[PDB]
PDB file of all heavy atoms in Angstrom:
ATOM      1  N   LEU A   1       2.568 -39.078 226.444  1.00 38.70           N
ATOM      2  CA  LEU A   1       2.023 -38.622 227.725  1.00 38.70           C
ATOM      3  C   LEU A   1       0.518 -38.629 227.750  1.00 38.70           C
ATOM      4  O   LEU A   1      -0.133 -38.839 226.694  1.00 38.70           O
ATOM      5  CB  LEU A   1       2.481 -37.139 227.880  1.00 38.70           C
ATOM      6  CG  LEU A   1       3.937 -36.761 228.144  1.00 38.70           C
ATOM      7  CD1 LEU A   1       4.350 -35.645 227.308  1.00 38.70           C
ATOM      8  CD2 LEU A   1       4.103 -36.469 229.664  1.00 38.70           C
ATOM      9  N   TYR A   2      -0.049 -38.613 228.988  1.00 37.35           N
ATOM     10  CA  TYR A   2      -1.542 -38.716 229.076  1.00 37.35           C
ATOM     11  C   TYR A   2      -1.980 -38.127 230.363  1.00 37.35           C
ATOM     12  O   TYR A   2      -1.442 -38.439 231.427  1.00 37.35           O
ATOM     13  CB  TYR A   2      -1.997 -40.196 229.057  1.00 37.35           C
ATOM     14  CG  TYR A   2      -3.477 -40.272 229.209  1.00 37.35           C
ATOM     15  CD1 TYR A   2      -4.266 -40.219 228.049  1.00 37.35           C
ATOM     16  CD2 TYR A   2      -4.125 -40.421 230.465  1.00 37.35           C
ATOM     17  CE1 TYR A   2      -5.639 -40.230 228.161  1.00 37.35           C
ATOM     18  CE2 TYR A   2      -5.446 -40.444 230.592  1.00 37.35           C
ATOM     19  CZ  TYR A   2      -6.271 -40.406 229.420  1.00 37.35           C
ATOM     20  OH  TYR A   2      -7.569 -40.416 229.568  1.00 37.35           O
ATOM     21  N   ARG A   3      -2.918 -37.160 230.229  1.00 37.16           N
ATOM     22  CA  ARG A   3      -3.714 -36.702 231.298  1.00 37.16           C
ATOM     23  C   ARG A   3      -5.219 -36.775 230.934  1.00 37.16           C
ATOM     24  O   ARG A   3      -5.443 -36.850 229.698  1.00 37.16           O
ATOM     25  CB  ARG A   3      -3.385 -35.197 231.656  1.00 37.16           C
ATOM     26  CG  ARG A   3      -1.949 -34.912 231.924  1.00 37.16           C
ATOM     27  CD  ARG A   3      -1.424 -35.769 233.123  1.00 37.16           C
ATOM     28  NE  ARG A   3      -2.263 -35.619 234.271  1.00 37.16           N
ATOM     29  CZ  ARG A   3      -2.431 -36.626 235.144  1.00 37.16           C
ATOM     30  NH1 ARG A   3      -1.825 -37.796 234.983  1.00 37.16           N
ATOM     31  NH2 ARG A   3      -3.121 -36.395 236.267  1.00 37.16           N
ATOM     32  N   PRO A   4      -6.138 -36.835 231.855  1.00 37.93           N
ATOM     33  CA  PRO A   4      -7.550 -36.973 231.512  1.00 37.93           C
ATOM     34  C   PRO A   4      -8.061 -35.712 230.682  1.00 37.93           C
ATOM     35  O   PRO A   4      -7.579 -34.607 230.938  1.00 37.93           O
ATOM     36  CB  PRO A   4      -8.289 -37.039 232.840  1.00 37.93           C
ATOM     37  CG  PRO A   4      -7.215 -37.491 233.802  1.00 37.93           C
ATOM     38  CD  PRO A   4      -6.013 -36.878 233.313  1.00 37.93           C
ATOM     39  N   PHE A   5      -8.856 -36.005 229.718  1.00 38.24           N
ATOM     40  CA  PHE A   5      -9.354 -34.903 228.812  1.00 38.24           C
ATOM     41  C   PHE A   5      -9.773 -33.705 229.519  1.00 38.24           C
ATOM     42  O   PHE A   5      -9.426 -32.603 229.114  1.00 38.24           O
ATOM     43  CB  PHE A   5     -10.626 -35.375 227.918  1.00 38.24           C
ATOM     44  CG  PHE A   5     -10.831 -34.499 226.730  1.00 38.24           C
ATOM     45  CD1 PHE A   5      -9.893 -34.441 225.687  1.00 38.24           C
ATOM     46  CD2 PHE A   5     -12.110 -33.897 226.555  1.00 38.24           C
ATOM     47  CE1 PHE A   5     -10.132 -33.664 224.499  1.00 38.24           C
ATOM     48  CE2 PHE A   5     -12.401 -33.204 225.350  1.00 38.24           C
ATOM     49  CZ  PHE A   5     -11.441 -33.082 224.351  1.00 38.24           C
ATOM     50  N   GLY A   6     -10.576 -33.863 230.604  1.00 39.39           N
ATOM     51  CA  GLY A   6     -11.023 -32.684 231.372  1.00 39.39           C
ATOM     52  C   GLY A   6      -9.936 -31.762 231.970  1.00 39.39           C
ATOM     53  O   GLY A   6     -10.059 -30.595 232.125  1.00 39.39           O
ATOM     54  N   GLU A   7      -8.804 -32.416 232.307  1.00 38.87           N
ATOM     55  CA  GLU A   7      -7.642 -31.741 232.859  1.00 38.87           C
ATOM     56  C   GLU A   7      -6.927 -30.959 231.821  1.00 38.87           C
ATOM     57  O   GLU A   7      -6.480 -29.846 232.031  1.00 38.87           O
ATOM     58  CB  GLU A   7      -6.668 -32.830 233.481  1.00 38.87           C
ATOM     59  CG  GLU A   7      -5.821 -32.453 234.617  1.00 38.87           C
ATOM     60  CD  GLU A   7      -5.217 -33.582 235.163  1.00 38.87           C
ATOM     61  OE1 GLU A   7      -5.978 -34.474 235.730  1.00 38.87           O
ATOM     62  OE2 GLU A   7      -3.940 -33.758 235.097  1.00 38.87           O
ATOM     63  N   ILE A   8      -6.711 -31.626 230.655  1.00 39.44           N
ATOM     64  CA  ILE A   8      -6.184 -30.874 229.483  1.00 39.44           C
ATOM     65  C   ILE A   8      -6.974 -29.576 229.202  1.00 39.44           C
ATOM     66  O   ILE A   8      -6.440 -28.604 228.960  1.00 39.44           O
ATOM     67  CB  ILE A   8      -6.001 -31.674 228.159  1.00 39.44           C
ATOM     68  CG1 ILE A   8      -5.398 -33.004 228.410  1.00 39.44           C
ATOM     69  CG2 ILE A   8      -5.291 -30.814 227.110  1.00 39.44           C
ATOM     70  CD1 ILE A   8      -5.211 -33.885 227.227  1.00 39.44           C
ATOM     71  N   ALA A   9      -8.281 -29.868 229.289  1.00 38.78           N
ATOM     72  CA  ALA A   9      -9.306 -28.839 228.999  1.00 38.78           C
ATOM     73  C   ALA A   9      -9.112 -27.649 229.909  1.00 38.78           C
ATOM     74  O   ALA A   9      -9.146 -26.527 229.416  1.00 38.78           O
ATOM     75  CB  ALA A   9     -10.702 -29.423 229.120  1.00 38.78           C
ATOM     76  N   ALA A  10      -9.018 -27.896 231.180  1.00 37.88           N
ATOM     77  CA  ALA A  10      -8.875 -26.779 232.191  1.00 37.88           C
ATOM     78  C   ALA A  10      -7.575 -26.069 232.069  1.00 37.88           C
ATOM     79  O   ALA A  10      -7.574 -24.802 232.117  1.00 37.88           O
ATOM     80  CB  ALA A  10      -9.050 -27.260 233.646  1.00 37.88           C
ATOM     81  N   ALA A  11      -6.445 -26.783 231.832  1.00 36.52           N
ATOM     82  CA  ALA A  11      -5.145 -26.146 231.592  1.00 36.52           C
ATOM     83  C   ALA A  11      -5.162 -25.334 230.279  1.00 36.52           C
ATOM     84  O   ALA A  11      -4.528 -24.309 230.177  1.00 36.52           O
ATOM     85  CB  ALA A  11      -4.099 -27.278 231.425  1.00 36.52           C
ATOM     86  N   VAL A  12      -5.973 -25.732 229.261  1.00 35.52           N
ATOM     87  CA  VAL A  12      -5.958 -25.058 227.988  1.00 35.52           C
ATOM     88  C   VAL A  12      -6.797 -23.785 228.152  1.00 35.52           C
ATOM     89  O   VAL A  12      -6.452 -22.760 227.620  1.00 35.52           O
ATOM     90  CB  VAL A  12      -6.395 -25.895 226.778  1.00 35.52           C
ATOM     91  CG1 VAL A  12      -6.686 -25.021 225.568  1.00 35.52           C
ATOM     92  CG2 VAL A  12      -5.276 -26.912 226.424  1.00 35.52           C
ATOM     93  N   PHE A  13      -7.940 -23.851 228.872  1.00 36.82           N
ATOM     94  CA  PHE A  13      -8.672 -22.654 229.333  1.00 36.82           C
ATOM     95  C   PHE A  13      -7.850 -21.702 230.100  1.00 36.82           C
ATOM     96  O   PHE A  13      -7.908 -20.434 229.838  1.00 36.82           O
ATOM     97  CB  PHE A  13      -9.900 -23.130 230.157  1.00 36.82           C
ATOM     98  CG  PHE A  13     -10.907 -22.001 230.420  1.00 36.82           C
ATOM     99  CD1 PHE A  13     -11.828 -21.830 229.485  1.00 36.82           C
ATOM    100  CD2 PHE A  13     -10.860 -21.245 231.548  1.00 36.82           C
ATOM    101  CE1 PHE A  13     -12.806 -20.862 229.646  1.00 36.82           C
ATOM    102  CE2 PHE A  13     -11.844 -20.262 231.720  1.00 36.82           C
ATOM    103  CZ  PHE A  13     -12.834 -20.055 230.750  1.00 36.82           C
ATOM    104  N   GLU A  14      -6.905 -22.102 230.977  1.00 36.54           N
ATOM    105  CA  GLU A  14      -5.987 -21.232 231.689  1.00 36.54           C
ATOM    106  C   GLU A  14      -5.114 -20.479 230.719  1.00 36.54           C
ATOM    107  O   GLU A  14      -4.980 -19.286 230.747  1.00 36.54           O
ATOM    108  CB  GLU A  14      -5.022 -22.026 232.600  1.00 36.54           C
ATOM    109  CG  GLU A  14      -5.711 -22.758 233.850  1.00 36.54           C
ATOM    110  CD  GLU A  14      -6.040 -21.797 234.963  1.00 36.54           C
ATOM    111  OE1 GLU A  14      -5.929 -20.557 234.850  1.00 36.54           O
ATOM    112  OE2 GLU A  14      -6.366 -22.310 236.062  1.00 36.54           O
ATOM    113  N   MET A  15      -4.505 -21.289 229.754  1.00 37.87           N
ATOM    114  CA  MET A  15      -3.572 -20.747 228.840  1.00 37.87           C
ATOM    115  C   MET A  15      -4.224 -19.814 227.841  1.00 37.87           C
ATOM    116  O   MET A  15      -3.641 -18.760 227.569  1.00 37.87           O
ATOM    117  CB  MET A  15      -2.923 -21.925 228.052  1.00 37.87           C
ATOM    118  CG  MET A  15      -2.042 -21.394 226.851  1.00 37.87           C
ATOM    119  SD  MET A  15      -1.603 -22.980 226.010  1.00 37.87           S
ATOM    120  CE  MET A  15      -2.956 -23.166 224.899  1.00 37.87           C
ATOM    121  N   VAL A  16      -5.397 -20.175 227.367  1.00 41.95           N
ATOM    122  CA  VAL A  16      -6.026 -19.348 226.400  1.00 41.95           C
ATOM    123  C   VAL A  16      -6.452 -17.957 227.167  1.00 41.95           C
ATOM    124  O   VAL A  16      -6.366 -16.972 226.543  1.00 41.95           O
ATOM    125  CB  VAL A  16      -7.343 -20.070 225.721  1.00 41.95           C
ATOM    126  CG1 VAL A  16      -8.074 -19.111 224.814  1.00 41.95           C
ATOM    127  CG2 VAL A  16      -6.820 -21.289 224.916  1.00 41.95           C
ATOM    128  N   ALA A  17      -6.846 -18.062 228.417  1.00 41.70           N
ATOM    129  CA  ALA A  17      -7.081 -16.876 229.234  1.00 41.70           C
ATOM    130  C   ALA A  17      -5.822 -16.048 229.388  1.00 41.70           C
ATOM    131  O   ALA A  17      -5.907 -14.847 229.217  1.00 41.70           O
ATOM    132  CB  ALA A  17      -7.751 -17.268 230.533  1.00 41.70           C
ATOM    133  N   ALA A  18      -4.722 -16.654 229.776  1.00 40.73           N
ATOM    134  CA  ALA A  18      -3.458 -15.988 229.793  1.00 40.73           C
ATOM    135  C   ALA A  18      -3.158 -15.304 228.455  1.00 40.73           C
ATOM    136  O   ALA A  18      -2.712 -14.196 228.382  1.00 40.73           O
ATOM    137  CB  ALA A  18      -2.389 -16.974 230.227  1.00 40.73           C
ATOM    138  N   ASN A  19      -3.343 -16.113 227.382  1.00 44.79           N
ATOM    139  CA  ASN A  19      -3.115 -15.577 226.013  1.00 44.79           C
ATOM    140  C   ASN A  19      -3.890 -14.308 225.788  1.00 44.79           C
ATOM    141  O   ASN A  19      -3.368 -13.490 225.088  1.00 44.79           O
ATOM    142  CB  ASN A  19      -3.453 -16.610 224.966  1.00 44.79           C
ATOM    143  CG  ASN A  19      -2.366 -17.612 224.702  1.00 44.79           C
ATOM    144  OD1 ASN A  19      -1.192 -17.475 225.221  1.00 44.79           O
ATOM    145  ND2 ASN A  19      -2.669 -18.580 223.941  1.00 44.79           N
ATOM    146  N   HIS A  20      -5.047 -14.208 226.346  1.00 46.63           N
ATOM    147  CA  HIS A  20      -5.909 -12.999 226.159  1.00 46.63           C
ATOM    148  C   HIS A  20      -5.724 -12.025 227.254  1.00 46.63           C
ATOM    149  O   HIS A  20      -6.353 -10.944 227.249  1.00 46.63           O
ATOM    150  CB  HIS A  20      -7.443 -13.308 225.975  1.00 46.63           C
ATOM    151  CG  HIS A  20      -7.826 -13.924 224.746  1.00 46.63           C
ATOM    152  ND1 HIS A  20      -8.724 -13.319 223.925  1.00 46.63           N
ATOM    153  CD2 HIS A  20      -7.572 -15.164 224.212  1.00 46.63           C
ATOM    154  CE1 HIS A  20      -8.892 -14.078 222.861  1.00 46.63           C
ATOM    155  NE2 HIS A  20      -8.284 -15.269 223.079  1.00 46.63           N
ATOM    156  N   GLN A  21      -4.892 -12.316 228.248  1.00 46.03           N
ATOM    157  CA  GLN A  21      -4.734 -11.453 229.404  1.00 46.03           C
ATOM    158  C   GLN A  21      -6.107 -11.290 230.182  1.00 46.03           C
ATOM    159  O   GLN A  21      -6.434 -10.241 230.605  1.00 46.03           O
ATOM    160  CB  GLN A  21      -4.228 -10.101 229.040  1.00 46.03           C
ATOM    161  CG  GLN A  21      -2.719 -10.050 228.904  1.00 46.03           C
ATOM    162  CD  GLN A  21      -2.246  -8.797 228.226  1.00 46.03           C
ATOM    163  OE1 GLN A  21      -1.721  -8.800 227.097  1.00 46.03           O
ATOM    164  NE2 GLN A  21      -2.567  -7.649 228.874  1.00 46.03           N
ATOM    165  N   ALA A  22      -6.835 -12.396 230.267  1.00 43.66           N
ATOM    166  CA  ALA A  22      -8.099 -12.446 231.007  1.00 43.66           C
ATOM    167  C   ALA A  22      -7.918 -13.123 232.283  1.00 43.66           C
ATOM    168  O   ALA A  22      -7.179 -14.094 232.433  1.00 43.66           O
ATOM    169  CB  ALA A  22      -9.199 -13.084 230.153  1.00 43.66           C
ATOM    170  N   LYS A  23      -8.626 -12.593 233.336  1.00 44.47           N
ATOM    171  CA  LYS A  23      -8.467 -13.122 234.726  1.00 44.47           C
ATOM    172  C   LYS A  23      -9.206 -14.422 234.843  1.00 44.47           C
ATOM    173  O   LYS A  23     -10.310 -14.568 234.434  1.00 44.47           O
ATOM    174  CB  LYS A  23      -9.013 -12.116 235.769  1.00 44.47           C
ATOM    175  CG  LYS A  23      -8.661 -12.483 237.229  1.00 44.47           C
ATOM    176  CD  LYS A  23      -9.788 -12.329 238.212  1.00 44.47           C
ATOM    177  CE  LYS A  23      -9.333 -12.892 239.550  1.00 44.47           C
ATOM    178  NZ  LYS A  23     -10.352 -12.826 240.630  1.00 44.47           N
ATOM    179  N   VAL A  24      -8.563 -15.436 235.460  1.00 44.94           N
ATOM    180  CA  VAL A  24      -9.273 -16.713 235.706  1.00 44.94           C
ATOM    181  C   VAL A  24      -8.979 -17.147 237.174  1.00 44.94           C
ATOM    182  O   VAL A  24      -7.969 -17.124 237.699  1.00 44.94           O
ATOM    183  CB  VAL A  24      -8.891 -17.820 234.669  1.00 44.94           C
ATOM    184  CG1 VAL A  24      -8.841 -19.184 235.209  1.00 44.94           C
ATOM    185  CG2 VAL A  24      -9.802 -17.680 233.472  1.00 44.94           C
ATOM    186  N   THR A  25     -10.077 -17.632 237.812  1.00 41.88           N
ATOM    187  CA  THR A  25     -10.091 -18.017 239.184  1.00 41.88           C
ATOM    188  C   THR A  25     -10.502 -19.475 239.176  1.00 41.88           C
ATOM    189  O   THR A  25     -11.217 -19.840 238.206  1.00 41.88           O
ATOM    190  CB  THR A  25     -11.101 -17.241 239.946  1.00 41.88           C
ATOM    191  OG1 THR A  25     -12.338 -17.885 239.933  1.00 41.88           O
ATOM    192  CG2 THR A  25     -11.177 -15.763 239.434  1.00 41.88           C
ATOM    193  N   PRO A  26     -10.157 -20.234 240.220  1.00 44.66           N
ATOM    194  CA  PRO A  26     -10.547 -21.622 240.219  1.00 44.66           C
ATOM    195  C   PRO A  26     -12.103 -21.961 240.221  1.00 44.66           C
ATOM    196  O   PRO A  26     -12.455 -23.173 240.095  1.00 44.66           O
ATOM    197  CB  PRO A  26      -9.913 -22.098 241.618  1.00 44.66           C
ATOM    198  CG  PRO A  26      -8.745 -21.225 241.756  1.00 44.66           C
ATOM    199  CD  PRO A  26      -9.304 -19.877 241.333  1.00 44.66           C
ATOM    200  N   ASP A  27     -12.885 -20.907 240.346  1.00 43.17           N
ATOM    201  CA  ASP A  27     -14.351 -21.000 240.144  1.00 43.17           C
ATOM    202  C   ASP A  27     -14.785 -21.173 238.719  1.00 43.17           C
ATOM    203  O   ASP A  27     -15.681 -21.892 238.313  1.00 43.17           O
ATOM    204  CB  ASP A  27     -15.125 -19.825 240.838  1.00 43.17           C
ATOM    205  CG  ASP A  27     -14.646 -19.675 242.327  1.00 43.17           C
ATOM    206  OD1 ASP A  27     -14.900 -20.620 243.076  1.00 43.17           O
ATOM    207  OD2 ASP A  27     -14.077 -18.647 242.768  1.00 43.17           O
ATOM    208  N   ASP A  28     -14.103 -20.319 237.806  1.00 41.92           N
ATOM    209  CA  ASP A  28     -14.265 -20.383 236.410  1.00 41.92           C
ATOM    210  C   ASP A  28     -13.933 -21.738 235.909  1.00 41.92           C
ATOM    211  O   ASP A  28     -14.647 -22.272 235.090  1.00 41.92           O
ATOM    212  CB  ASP A  28     -13.309 -19.474 235.697  1.00 41.92           C
ATOM    213  CG  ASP A  28     -13.364 -18.010 236.096  1.00 41.92           C
ATOM    214  OD1 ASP A  28     -14.493 -17.443 236.024  1.00 41.92           O
ATOM    215  OD2 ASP A  28     -12.289 -17.407 236.496  1.00 41.92           O
ATOM    216  N   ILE A  29     -12.900 -22.348 236.480  1.00 39.70           N
ATOM    217  CA  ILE A  29     -12.499 -23.655 236.148  1.00 39.70           C
ATOM    218  C   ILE A  29     -13.562 -24.714 236.577  1.00 39.70           C
ATOM    219  O   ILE A  29     -13.713 -25.758 235.853  1.00 39.70           O
ATOM    220  CB  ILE A  29     -11.147 -24.027 236.789  1.00 39.70           C
ATOM    221  CG1 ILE A  29     -10.038 -23.060 236.321  1.00 39.70           C
ATOM    222  CG2 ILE A  29     -10.813 -25.499 236.713  1.00 39.70           C
ATOM    223  CD1 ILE A  29     -10.010 -22.844 234.747  1.00 39.70           C
ATOM    224  N   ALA A  30     -14.266 -24.444 237.667  1.00 38.40           N
ATOM    225  CA  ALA A  30     -15.187 -25.433 238.203  1.00 38.40           C
ATOM    226  C   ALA A  30     -16.414 -25.467 237.347  1.00 38.40           C
ATOM    227  O   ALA A  30     -16.871 -26.587 237.037  1.00 38.40           O
ATOM    228  CB  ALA A  30     -15.501 -25.144 239.634  1.00 38.40           C
TER     229      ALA A  30
END
């Protein structure tokens, strides 16, 4: 499988935030 590094990056930021129960909005991602 393949997605661009930056996309894996944003999805992993989401997950790691979910893992910590921390709020994330599409601005954090930007």
Side-chain angles (χ1 to χ4, degrees):
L1 286 137
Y2 182 87
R3 305 304 305 150
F5 197 61
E7 209 168 294
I8 309 179
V12 168
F13 196 84
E14 296 278 10
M15 172 187 85
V16 173
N19 279 349
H20 286 243
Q21 276 166 246
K23 194 218 170 181
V24 148
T25 87
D27 306 297
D28 302 305
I29 296 317

